[PDB]
């Protein structure tokens, strides 16, 4: 197998119409995080776990329409209540690791709601062609977060 | 107090006059890595350990002459023998986390040695000012790696 690595930094800024503590709870509470992050559609998360603390972990394993395992695992490094979450994570398709990332999620109250900046520093492995999927997936994820906050 | 985050990506390319398996072995063997990575001389070595596997942990704690703890903790993610190491790590000064990083170390054989590319994607926290510390500290490490490899023969 030919080994290679491609690095990138992705940044997404969102302005949510919700108070900062409520936005943060959407990340800290397993029931909430599962709902918006792991349940992407009429298809519920079948295999989700969260231990939300520095030194903690998160897991979401999903079989796609074609039976391919998308295995997400994260390890929490820094958590400042209502202000910041930093975690490293990896994605595997089947048993093949396609990427590793350091994600920073920063939150701050602003007039009208919350400003959130999501930064992902990622490395894609061994010829896996991202082709913008990571940024698109993340944008849609945060769209779902916003929908979740509205439904509340 | 004032929360902030500053992101950067540092890239270092070092060439070593040692073959790839031997260079890689200096990273994979705890007793080898301790010799080049866990020393300072004037500082107090407090603890070093390495569990070199995906999901494994590494620590390196040292205290400066002011009694200030410099704490390195790493979590390994991807390991391809003689080719690649990826780990995430954090640094603390005392009880204060100053950074978190994703580090990729790529190894490639070339005529008469090994090409190493060390990419660190880092976030500095809460007003901590790097100003060359990270790159310089990493190079010191690699200097010592190089010397370690020369001492082996």
Residue B5 is nearest to which of A84, A88, A90, comparing CB atoms? A84
**Alpha-carbon gap, residue B93 to B21, rounded angstroms:** 34
The answer to whether the beta carbons of residues B91 and B72 sit under 8 Å apart is yes
The technique is: X-ray
Q: How many domains does chain B have?
A: 1
The residue of A12, A75, A82, A86 whose CB has the most chain B CBs within 10 angstroms, and thus the best one to mutate to test that interface, is A86
Q: Which residues of B touch A75 (CB under 8 A)?
A: 75, 88
Sequence-distant (≥ 6) Cβ neighbours of residue A85 within 8 angstroms: A27, A76, A78, A79, A103, A104, A105
Phi, psi of A69 (to 5 degrees): -75, 120
Could you tell me where the DSSP H helices lie in chain B? 20-28, 30-37, 133-152
CATH code of the domain in which A20 resides: 3.30.530.20
> What is the number of other CB atoms lying within 10 angstroms of the CB of residue B139?
14
Range of the domain at A6: 1-152
């Amino acid at each position: 197998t030919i080994r290679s690595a491609e690095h990138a930094t992705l940044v997404i800024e969102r302005h949510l119409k919700a108070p900062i503590a409520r936005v943060f709870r959407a990340w800290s509470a397993p029931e909430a995080k599962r709902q918006w992050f792991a349940c992407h559609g009429e298809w519920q998360a079948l295999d989700y776990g969260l231990d939300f603390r520095p030194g903690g972990t998160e897991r979401n394993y999903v079989a796609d329409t074609d039976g391919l395992l998308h295995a997400y695992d994260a390890h929490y490094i820094d958590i400042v209540p209502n202000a910041r979450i930093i975690y490293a994570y990896e994605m595997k398709l089947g048993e093949t690791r396609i990427s590793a990332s350091l994600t920073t999620v920063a939150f701050e109250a602003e007039p009208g709601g919350t400003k959130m900046v999501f930064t992902e520093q990622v490395v894609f492995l061994d010829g896996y062609a991202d082709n913008g999927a990571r940024l698109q997936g993340t944008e849609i994820g945060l769209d779902n977060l916003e929908l979740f906050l509205e439904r509340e």
